[PDB]
Design a protein around this ligand. Structure first.
Ligand SMILES: COc1cc(C(=O)NNC(=O)c2cc(C(C)(C)N)cc(-c3ccc(F)cc3)n2)ccc1OC1CC1
Lengths: 1357, 57, 99, 51, 55
């Protein structure tokens, strides 16, 4: 049993943890004089005792008591570390030299892709572009060397701890040499830093060290991106990013923010958090007129300075009674800090340069200063007041809200179901309204009156929707934790922090809870439930067993409650999402915009304001209190901070926490809305309020709610007086509507705040996304701060890390709009993980690296390469599908989606190999004196056939290759272990499923065996129609965790079998290229594949079929647009091809807009006739089980066995019998399912690699290719995605201007007809194995959907 | 006139109904659920009557 | 007689819609001893603007409550929606240093 | 019509008596549940006869 | 007609008088005016089952 610790911050820096450790170590309140400084020193944690008992720390402690060293705060040492400029002839020369190598290598790796792209477009370093870029990036600037050095030192302190803690448990790294001057005692339970020259000590947590490492990495990345980009832009102004930062200013920015966090302790983050505000103003000062920006600027300065004043107040109040009392600067008491602030902000405005690109990208600043040590008990105290406060409403205000909600529901019903909801109360309406009931129509907002909204509030509905009667296990199961039941809440605190009467009370309270109640995690909670049944959730919502339930608590850590109430919370949110959000699609003409933050907005809600609208959804679903569960239950439970180190003080002989007296971090009578819970109910009530305001103020509120930001838009037709301008009118309308918004929100318990609300004339910062004049200003750099060695993996998986580096790094291309800056940055951080950090793997010390070295020897001899260095340049270019190192296929630089990954991988390999073979990608494939591409393709098509489980595999990945011809993935590797741990689960729903899993994939493989043409996507649909699709979604989820074996073992340790499985997986995946590409004459093929008249898509066809032996596979194979289309820049006599034209008049169109409509590449729809019946009678998990079976009626109508097929497949799943079910099936008017089937496995849309706005610059004409593709294939469906041709041309327009600094006037794409083939719908011969089809349904019956019952079919009509 | 004044009486007596209903819905809250009174105030509905039948069989 | 008998019913229909357009409801909340919940409390407007003033119903920001229940605009509410927003004394210092 | 209006007024002056006892502060309460619950039940047994 | 409007009123005016009894009986008490809203709901359920198993 091994423990692998985090390499990045994934969690929170705990104020309570740092306070407890430091307070125990130094025998006095360290950070705050709370109860997590008292119990920490009376009864310390064993992990803290071990840290303090060390010989290194026992001497620092003694120095401190004798007064020789000054105890400080971790932000002080953050400032010290970050400005650590310690140099020698052996540290600033062995870091400059390593950086110079990384940069040269990344440019040399990028060179081959750049060569391929320039060769295709027709435009150790072969490309003169990267040859010029190399003479520029020869000497890293001192600012960049600074953060690279700091990141290397911090990171390889962290690596040295992680590997050594994997090797032996309890390891404490004691390091005083890596960083000169500093001395770390690092450990997963604490980090003690001592600086000798200054005589200072901080105690902090492992997460805070992770955060320091993250800060150094993030500033290294900001500097790297910036200085790659500035060199690019010194070469071509259109080759780098849109921003133009100067990095001496940026480093000064870093140091002044560090100084702010040094003066202000933890509190300083309050000030840093107002940075967003300041940047916002600088954007507004460019985009807005005087009154809007002046008002925002003044409110923003008030916000910043109240943040600073509150920061000083809290700092001096906190630090007064602690050991940090004399660590408060005199620049805080005497108010000189205002100058420091003035210099910080004044630097931001200088980094922005009054340029909207710099300003929008400057949002990375909000993330580059670390994270605060959030105080858990104080954040609860700030919320106790807002949630106990009594609210006073006019009964008329509640009636109008209820009525405006009921109006939305009546309107949505009439719009969807062509009907009014069935009224229990029709006698309540007047004649004017009761006449709207009978005509099934509604008045518009214009004809609506507030009396109408009062009268509507009396209507009561009959049930229109139905509860799902059997739990959806895919919605109740996840990786996160679960609050104990109330009586076991004390199990969330260490046994040492709890008094004896609580320890020996909770040793007896466990003897009366089920293993599921004591579980401590959701997955474990359900897997351990030996009395589980699918109808237990449903019986709770009907019997209302979640009311006055003595097991209820709320535990703040993010809030959580026991499983029985979390179930109801998720069900209530899900019913609103499925059934009710259809009615609320928002989830001079003086115009205006009002932006509000609804983060605290849940706090102000009460039962009187929530459950008047939520009571209308109770009636629609025929339930009592399901949607009102929160405000009816939480007022009776105790809200407690259950973070580990922040226990409550429990008075003697109090065991129940409803009897534990209130204190910091523990209170009662919380009225009003734990956040997240019921977030969807509060959104539609807010939209109803907006509709009521629009009525009261006579303006046309458009709305847009997304998370915690409500972006109202307001219009109000007026005609202005003389001397009043449009801007003045808009400002007046904004100020008036703001008054009304305030009054009406206050009418229901909600007091807005000038800080969190503001007004603009144009929709600013709508999605944390600066769109201005249709142009888009990205925050791309912010997305890429934490790109590094082992990101986003489990057990440091080498391939997933590569995948995440590559995926995150094309935010610099998709949004940043720099292909080459994304490329070079990708290659820096890829070369670093392959060539430098691979030998340091925490679990596989250099195994993976020795495998890479022998894979490179193989590559060297296969392609007869002159070096093992030039063999790594090749390994990191050829695709990851063939066991290579390239995570981003070259096609994704032009369009984001493809139906056929294998053709893209093969085209990528061809293009890359052209670098060494000097083939020309514009010219047809030809014979050349060197055969390296012939050898590559021959080893690809020629190989041993070893098909196994062909059909169950093509089902769960319709693009799988088979015959061990592609790299496996963690789900397949871990599946057979997941099912063997599940076979032992006490909950029989998973036990029996996992016990029958292997047999069910044996016969799920036999079902579609004998259907002579193979359609893997139809196979996908058959798969999803069956209860195994849902059985192994729970398996695919559990196989993504770490330590699958211990899931039921109650440890965070990774089992050694899991380590070995992951290690074998990684080593096989690394070495795949040796097997895929053998040297042995390419399998005794002394005659290599010929390239004259070769079509790569026929080759891909052959490789895929051969890989399974399958005589025919239809569907999947599709050409490559990159390969298929030959790029031209003039119209010759040929007069063929797609034509992409620039409609702008200016040569450079990056960061512009154009007349054209944006190109969303949407798939032509699935043309069908929807039959007439009562949709709402069926639950959504019944309605898409019909659309699946109807899709199978469509695809497989021609099989010899269809009547029996859909008879057994309709009775098994739906419960109807294929003639009662055929009535509900949509009837497809589309002949070709190959072209039109919509299924999980197929792209829904085909966008370009281009921000949407930019597509609006180009006009595409596909007319000349429909003339050629018609007179040859007539009007038959052919096999080349239509959307992706346009996507390719559009992206091609950008990429050419990136490398040329001119946008082409037009580009003509001329296809390779060879690559284009007919795609007509086959006739499916053979039967279905109908006894095997029933075997799947029977052995996986527990995951079957709800049966369309008999009291549910008669009322379908 | 007569048969038009009852229109006003109807339109106002409907507004009274809306008022008094929203007041019942809001007045049956955390302390009614606690005392087992909310269902008597908002009235039994489909999924609970269905259960009472299934018990009747 | 049917224009008089009908008018006396139309006067009890304006004072039932006056007594109902006047009610204020206090959200249910913790008791003053704060050991339990007390029901949502319904009462006439003016009798609700004295129970806040008396602090009989515990409420914070009581002056804003009285002002808003009255069809009246307070100072903080007028401050927060004003056409021009006034810089606090230290934000005038900051603004002077940024200039 | 006179009797109808008299009966309307006699009930509208008894609404007020209750509407004053409300801003100052079961058989009739539990006959409106049973009646409506019975109506939705008999509306549920209309769907049970079609099956 | 004026009897199709003088009969809609009496049924609209009996809704109001039923929604005033709920509010007054809930507010009035408690612990002896609410314990009786629970016993009498036990009665509701256990007499609804008795009218249904005999139809
Ligand atoms: C959404 O998944 C797919 C879509 C398509 C698709 O769209 N096939 N295309 C045509 O059927 C078509 C037909 C015709 C005709 C009727 C002869 N004039 C012309 C053209 C055409 C194209 C480009 C041009 F520039 C001009 C014309 N395309 C193909 C495959 C797909 O995925 C499956 C492989 C897995």
């Amino acid at each position: 049993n091994v423990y692998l610790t985090d390499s990045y911050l994934k969690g929170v820096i705990s104020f309570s943890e740092c306070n407890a450790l430091g307070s125990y170590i130094f025998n006095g309140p360290y950070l705050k004089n709370d109860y997590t400084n008292l119990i920490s020193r009376q009864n310390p944690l064993i992990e803290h005792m071990n840290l303090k008992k060390l010989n290194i720390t026992q001497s620092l402690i003694s120095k401190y008591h004798k007064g020789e060293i000054k105890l400080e705060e971790p932000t002080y040492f953050q400032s010290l570390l970050m400005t650590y400029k310690s140099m020698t002839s052996s540290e600033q020369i062995a870091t400059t030299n390593l950086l110079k190598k990384i940069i040269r290598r990344a440019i040399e790796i990028s060179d081959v892709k750049v060569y391929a792209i320039l060769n295709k477009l027709g435009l150790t370093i072969k490309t003169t572009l990267l040859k010029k870029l190399m003479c520029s990036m020869q000497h890293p600037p001192s600012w960049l060397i600074h953060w690279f050095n700091l990141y290397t030192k911090l990171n390889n302190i962290l690596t040295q701890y992680r590997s050594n803690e994997v090797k032996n448990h309890g390891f404490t790294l004691i390091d005083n040499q890596t960083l000169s001057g500093f001395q770390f005692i690092l450990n997963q339970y604490g980090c003690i830093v001592y600086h000798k020259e200054l005589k200072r000590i901080t105690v902090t947590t492992y997460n805070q060290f992770l955060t320091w490492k993250d800060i150094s990495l993030s500033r290294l990345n900001v500097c790297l991106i910036t200085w790659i980009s500035n060199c690019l832009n010194t070469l071509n102004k259109s080759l780098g990013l849109r921003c133009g930062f100067n990095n001496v200013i940026l480093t000064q920015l870093f140091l002044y923010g560090d100084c702010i966090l040094k003066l202000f302790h933890n509190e300083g983050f309050y000030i840093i958090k107002e940075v967003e505000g300041f940047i916002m103003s600088l954007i507004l000062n460019i985009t807005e007129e005087d009154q809007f920006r002046k008002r925002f600027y003044n409110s923003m300065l008030n916000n910043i300075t109240d943040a600073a004043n509150k920061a000083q107040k809290n700092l001096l109040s906190r630090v007064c009674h602690t050991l940090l009392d004399k660590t408060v600067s005199d620049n805080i008491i005497n108010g000189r800090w205002i100058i420091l602030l003035s210099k910080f902000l004044k630097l931001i405005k200088l980094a922005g340069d009054n340029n909207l690109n710099n300003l929008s990208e400057l949002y990375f600043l909000f993330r580059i200063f670390g994270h605060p040590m959030v105080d858990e008990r104080q954040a609860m105290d700030a919320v106790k007041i807002n949630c106990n406060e009594t609210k006073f409403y006019l009964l008329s205000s509640l009636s109008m809200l209820r009525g405006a909600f009921i109006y939305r529901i009546i309107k949505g019903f009439v719009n969807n179901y062509n009907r009014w909801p069935t009224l229990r109360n029709a006698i309540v309406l007047p004649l004017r309204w009761l006449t709207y009931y009978k005509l099934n129509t509604y008045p518009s907002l214009l004809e609506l009156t507030e009396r109408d909204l009062i009268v509507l509030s009396g209507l009561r509905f009959y049930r229109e929707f139905r509860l799902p009667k059997k739990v959806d296990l895919e919605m109740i199961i996840n990786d996160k934790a679960i609050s104990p039941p109330k009586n076991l809440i004390w199990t969330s605190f260490p046994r040492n922090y709890m008094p004896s009467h609580i320890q020996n009370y909770i040793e007896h309270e466990k003897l009366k809870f089920s293993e599921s109640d004591k579980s401590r995690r959701v997955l474990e909670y359900y897997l351990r439930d030996n009395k589980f049944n699918e109808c237990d959730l449903y019986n709770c919502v009907v019997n209302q067993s979640y009311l006055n339930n003595p097991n209820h608590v709320v535990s703040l850590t993010f809030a959580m409650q026991p499983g029985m109430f979390r179930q109801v919370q998720i069900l209530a949110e899900k019913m609103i999402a499925e059934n009710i959000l259809q009615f609320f699609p928002e989830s001079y003409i003086s115009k205006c915009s009002i932006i509000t933050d609804l983060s605290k907005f849940n706090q102000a809600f009460r039962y009187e304001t929530s459950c008047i609208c939520s009571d209308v959804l109770d009636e629609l679903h025929g339930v009592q209190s399901l949607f009102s569960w929160l405000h009816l239950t939480i007022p009776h439970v105790t809200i407690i901070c259950t973070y580990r180190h922040a226990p409550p003080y429990i008075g003697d002989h109090i065991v129940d926490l409803n009897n534990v007296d209130e204190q910091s971090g523990l209170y009662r009578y919380h009225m009003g809305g734990i956040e997240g819970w019921c977030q969807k109910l509060w959104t539609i009530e807010a939209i109803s309020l907006l509709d009521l305001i629009s009525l009261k103020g006579k303006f046309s509120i458009t709305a847009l709610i997304n998370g915690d930001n409500q972006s109202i838009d307001i219009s109000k037709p007026i005609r202005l007086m003389e001397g009043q301008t449009h801007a003045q009118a808009d400002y007046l309308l904004a100020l008036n509507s703001l008054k009304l918004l305030y009054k009406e929100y206050a009418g229901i318990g909600h007091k807005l705040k000038g800080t969190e609300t503001y007004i603009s004339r144009d929709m600013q910062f709508m999605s944390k996304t600066i769109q201005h004049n249709g142009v888009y200003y990205p925050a791309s750099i912010k997305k890429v701060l934490r790109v590094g060695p082992w990101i986003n993996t489990i057990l440091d998986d080498f391939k997933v890390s590569l995948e995440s580096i590559g995926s995150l790094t094309q935010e610099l291309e998709y949004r940043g709009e720099s292909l080459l800056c994304s490329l070079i940055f990708r290659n820096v951080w890829l070369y670093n993980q392959i060539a430098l950090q691979l030998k340091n793997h925490a679990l596989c010390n250099n195994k993976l690296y020795l495998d890479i070295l022998k894979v490179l020897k193989h590559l060297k001899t296969f392609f007869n390469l002159d070096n093992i260095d030039t063999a790594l340049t090749l390994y990191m270019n050829l695709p990851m599908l063939f066991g290579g190192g390239d995570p981003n296929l070259l096609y994704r630089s032009f369009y984001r989606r493809t139906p056929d990954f294998l053709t893209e991988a093969i085209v990528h390999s061809v293009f890359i190999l052209s670098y060494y073979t000097n083939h020309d990608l514009k010219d047809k494939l030809q014979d050349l004196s060197d055969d390296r591409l012939n050898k590559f393709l021959t080893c690809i098509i020629t190989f041993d056939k070893n098909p196994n489980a062909e059909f169950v595999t093509l089902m769960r990945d319709p693009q799988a290759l088979g015959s061990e011809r592609q790299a496996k993935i963690t789900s397949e590797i871990n599946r057979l272990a997941v099912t063997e741990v599940l076979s032992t689960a006490p909950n029989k729903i998973f036990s029996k499923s996992a016990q029958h899993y292997t047999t069910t994939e044996i016969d799920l493989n036999d079902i579609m065996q004998n259907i002579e043409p193979t359609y893997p996507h139809g196979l996908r649909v058959v798969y999803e129609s069956l209860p195994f699709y849902k059985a192994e979604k729970i398996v695919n989820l559990i196989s993504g965790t770490k330590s699958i074996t211990n899931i039921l073992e109650k440890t965070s340790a990774i089992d050694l079998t899991d380590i070995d499985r992951a290690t074998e997986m990684m080593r096989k995946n690394i070495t795949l290229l040796i097997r895929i590409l053998p040297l042995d004459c390419n399998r005794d093929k002394r005659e290599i594949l010929s390239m004259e008249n070769l079509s790569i898509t026929e080759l891909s066809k052959y490789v895929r079929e051969r890989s399974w032996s399958l005589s025919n596979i239809v569907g999947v194979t599709s050409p490559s647009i990159m390969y298929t289309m030959d790029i031209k820049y003039t119209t010759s006599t040929i007069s063929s091809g797609i034509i992409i034209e620039k409609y702008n008049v200016n040569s450079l169109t990056r960061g512009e807009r154009g007349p054209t409509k944006p190109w969303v590449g949407s798939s032509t729809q699935e043309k069908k006739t929807m039959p007439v019946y009562n949709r709402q009678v069926l639950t959504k998990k019944q309605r898409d089980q019909i659309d699946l079976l109807a899709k199978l009626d469509w695809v497989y109508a021609s099989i010899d066995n269809k009547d029996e097929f859909m008879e057994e497949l309709s009775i098994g799943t739906l419960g109807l019998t294929y003639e009662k079910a055929k009535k509900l099936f949509p009837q497809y008017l589309s002949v070709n399912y190959l072209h039109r089937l919509t299924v999980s496995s197929r792209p829904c849309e085909f966008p370009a690699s281009i921000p949407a706005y930019r597509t609006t610059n180009y006009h595409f004409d596909t007319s000349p290719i429909n003339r050629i593709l018609t007179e040859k294939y007539g009007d038959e469906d052919i096999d080349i995605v239509f959307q992706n041709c346009i996507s390719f041309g559009l992206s091609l327009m950008s990429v050419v201007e990136q490398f040329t600094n001119v946008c082409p006037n037009r580009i003509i794409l001329i296809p390779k007809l060879n690559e284009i083939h007919l795609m007509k719908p086959p006739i499916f011969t053979g039967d279905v194995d109908i006894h095997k089809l029933k075997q799947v349904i029977q052995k996986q019956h527990m995951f079957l959907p709800d049966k369309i019952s008999l009291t549910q079919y008669v009322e379908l009509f | 006139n007569i048969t038009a004044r009852l229109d006003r009486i109807d339109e106002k007596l409907s507004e009274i109904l809306g008022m008094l209903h929203t007041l019942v819905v809001a007045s049956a809250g955390p302390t009614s659920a606690r005392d087992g009174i909310r269902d008597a105030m908002i009235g039994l509905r489909e999924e609970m009557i269905e259960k009472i039948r299934t018990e009747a069989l």
